[PDB]
């Protein structure tokens, strides 16, 4: 029940940049019982800093920790690509033991407009009585993006499923996939299917559509 709050929730850092993130406890804890873990998608959390300021085995010298009482922080002298991950502070002071909500550290790169591609349902799908229209918005930056589905002058909200990829290990971009699914009938009933993407890289939306 000692609640741990991490700030910010998400943050980007250009390579070489100094980074600082904080962890605040609802009640004071011994600095010897406040730890930090690093986690990367697909693997277990790994001890990063123990007892507030000590680096765990193999952790780079660029990392550091500070604090006591209710206020703590983790600092990276100079940001490196493999520092990108989620860092969780943890208190092993009093039970129930708790973890902060985490700070997801991403890599800051130059903005990049999304590559949008729309795809009509397949005859194979149509034969089974279904119709999914897919739209890919690939390799863009930053992650913020809004996708709108328009069928014959009507915004289509329900029946859309979106999925985002983790920041690309090679170019630090993000990709998104959006799928609008209707029955075979609804789909044959309309002819204009549009996927509209609004990204900060441009004022006007990127538009991709098809007919029939």
């Amino acid at each position: 029940d000692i609640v741990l709050t991490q700030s910010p929730a998400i943050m980007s850092a250009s390579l070489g940049e100094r980074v600082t993130m904080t962890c605040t406890a609802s009640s004071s804890v011994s600095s010897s019982n406040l730890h930090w873990y690093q986690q990367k998608p697909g693997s277990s959390p790994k001890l990063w800093i123990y007892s507030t300021s000590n680096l765990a085995s193999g952790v780079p010298a660029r990392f550091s920790g500070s604090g006591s009482g209710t206020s703590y922080s983790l600092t990276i002298s100079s940001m490196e690509a493999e520092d990108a991950a989620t860092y969780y502070c943890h208190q092993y002071h009093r039970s129930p033991y708790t973890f902060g909500g985490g700070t997801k550290l991403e890599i800051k790169r130059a903005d990049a407009a999304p590559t949008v591609s729309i795809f009509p349902p397949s005859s194979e799908q149509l034969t089974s009585g279904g119709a999914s229209v897919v739209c890919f918005l690939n390799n863009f930056y930053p992650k913020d993006i809004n996708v709108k589905w328009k069928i014959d002058g009507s915004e289509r909200q329900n029946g859309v499923l979106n999925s985002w990829t983790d920041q690309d290990s090679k170019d630090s971009t993000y990709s998104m996939s959006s799928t609008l699914t209707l029955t075979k009938d609804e789909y044959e009933r309309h002819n204009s299917y549009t996927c509209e993407a609004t990204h900060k890289t441009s004022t006007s939306p990127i538009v991709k559509s098809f007919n029939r």
Binding site: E124, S128, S132, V134
Partner: peptide, 24 residues
């Protein structure tokens, strides 16, 4: 259900083309 995602319109994306697959 695996469905192929091939470009519909005349497709005017010069150097590269994006294709897809829907696993549903």
């Amino acid at each position: 259900s695996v469905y192929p995602l091939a470009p519909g319109s005349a497709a005017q994306t010069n150097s590269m083309v994006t294709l897809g697959c829907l696993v549903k």
